[PDB]
Design a protein around this ligand. Structure first.
Ligand SMILES: CCCCC/C=C\C/C=C\CCCCCCCC(=O)OC[C@@H](O)COP(=O)(O)O
Lengths: 219, 218
């Protein structure tokens, strides 16, 4: 087995620069061909570049020469991606990968790092506000929580401390014009249970150390 | 840059049926060395792509033989002889003949099921939110199929635009339905000077558009 481990998720402002790492665990780093590929959420794959740590060889996507610098330290088997003058539209999941060997080698690999999430935005770390989506009018009822105005991603949401998962839908976040994120989490339950069962949503936004439990009651 | 064009963009499949994904390159993928470096990947949500097939027709280790690849020059096809639930996700063609390496935009493969109408629910803003200075009205379309759904907001019968946002869940693994939330966002001020807030839903499983309303303050 070979494995690629990338550095942690980055949050930057427009105009700033980043440097993300991709560490290799294997024999013969110097004959690797390491690629970098990014993916905006919901979007396609964009090829950035390829590097051969054992030579001077880099190949770049012309659209990114000027922002992107590929490099590698042979002593630590780590490859690097530098990106200057970040733009909001550079927000993406960034992967390193080892897919090929030299042409003619017969080699085909499928080694991908776990990806490094890069968020480029002019906004500042902020915990969410949690508002209830209350049920109303022996069939089935719906209820939820609104998780509003937080930054950056992600947030996690559970119901009754994880004891409820059936009928739960936790929607993907949407970026508001404020630069803050907003999502709902909902759940459908029998309307006969509305007087008996307590419903609490557990919203956890690590980046700001916010942890909130909101009780969701009728009326 | 060698442009790679995938069709169809979206492919609903019924477990048991054969599927077919097409990739066209804007220029020949035959290398000067004679080989054709066209590869197929499958990416499941929140995961990275996995190699399925390399150089047109070769199965990557571990990949079952119900997957086959074919084609030549500029024209390539991925076939699944009998689809399964596990085959769901986004398929990308990838070329490594010419620099810069390029990818097609993806074909989404989803499970095809019988038409299911949404259950629609509407939630007025909370008292708690109103104290904050803002009003978010939320419309929920629940466990429906297929994805094509029209949600329109009506405030005192005036059609709204540009003040709502939608998001949609991934296809549910056990029932194959989608769910959707539409959020109308207003200022407390703009909110309070209207009475009827209405969510109107159009979808293939509804004989006619369904509205869910509240008159502010109940
Ligand atoms: C240390 C001395 C360096 C040797 C000089 C050789 C190459 C120059 C350095 C880097 C260029 C790497 C670019 C190669 C891109 C390869 C892309 C690719 O589809 O691989 C396919 C190969 O794994 C296998 O091919 P085949 O045997 O099936 O034909």
């Amino acid at each position: 087995e070979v494995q690629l481990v990338q550095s942690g998720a980055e949050v930057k402002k427009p105009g700033e620069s980043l440097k993300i790492s991709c560490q290799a665990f294997g024999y013969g780093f110097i004959n690797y061909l390491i690629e970098w590929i990014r993916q905006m959420p919901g979007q396609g794959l964009e090829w950035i570049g390829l590097i051969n740590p054992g030579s001077d060889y880099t190949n770049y996507n012309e659209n990114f020469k000027g922002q992107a610098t590929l490099s590698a330290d042979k002593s630590s088997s780590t490859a690097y991606l530098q990106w200057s003058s970040l733009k909001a539209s550079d927000t993406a999941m960034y992967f390193c990968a080892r897919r090929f060997g030299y042409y003619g080698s017969g080699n085909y690999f499928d080694y991908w790092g776990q990806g490094t999430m890069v968020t480029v935005s002019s906004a500042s770390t902020k915990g969410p506000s949690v508002f209830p989506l209350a049920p109303s009018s022996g069939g089935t009822a719906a209820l939820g929580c609104l998780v509003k105005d937080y930054f950056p991603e992600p947030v996690t949401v559970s119901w009754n401390s994880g004891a409820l998962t059936s009928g739960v839908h936790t929607f993907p976040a949407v970026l508001q014009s404020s630069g803050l994120y907003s999502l709902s989490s909902v759940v459908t339950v029998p309307s006969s249970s509305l007087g008996t069962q307590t419903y609490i949503c557990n919203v956890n936004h690590k980046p700001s150390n916010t942890k909130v439990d909101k009780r969701v009651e009728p009326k | 840059d060698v442009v790679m064009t995938q069709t169809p963009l979206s492919l609903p499949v019924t477990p048991g049926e054969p599927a077919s994904i097409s990739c066209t390159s804007g220029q020949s993928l035959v290398h000067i060395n004679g080989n054709t470096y066209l590869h197929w990947y499958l990416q499941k949500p929140g995961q990275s792509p996995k190699l399925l097939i390399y150089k047109v027709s070769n199965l990557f280790s571990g990949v079952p033989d119900r997957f086959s690849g074919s084609g030549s020059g500029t024209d390539f096809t991925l076939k699944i002889s009998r689809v399964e639930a596990e085959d769901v996700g986004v398929y990308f063609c990838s070329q490594s003949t010419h620099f810069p390496f390029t990818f097609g935009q993806g074909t989404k493969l989803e499970i095809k099921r019988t038409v299911a109408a949404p259950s629609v629910f509407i939630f007025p803003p909370s008292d708690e939110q109103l104290k904050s200075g803002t009003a978010s009205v939320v419309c929920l379309l629940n466990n429906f199929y297929p994805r094509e759904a029209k949600v329109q907001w009506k405030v005192d019968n005036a059609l709204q635009s540009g003040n709502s946002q939608e998001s949609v869940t991934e296809q549910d693994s056990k029932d194959s339905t989608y769910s959707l939330s539409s959020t109308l966002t207003l200022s407390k001020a703009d909110y309070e000077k209207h009475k009827v807030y209405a969510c109107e839903v159009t979808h293939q499983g509804l004989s006619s558009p369904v509205t869910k309303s509240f008159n502010r303050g109940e």
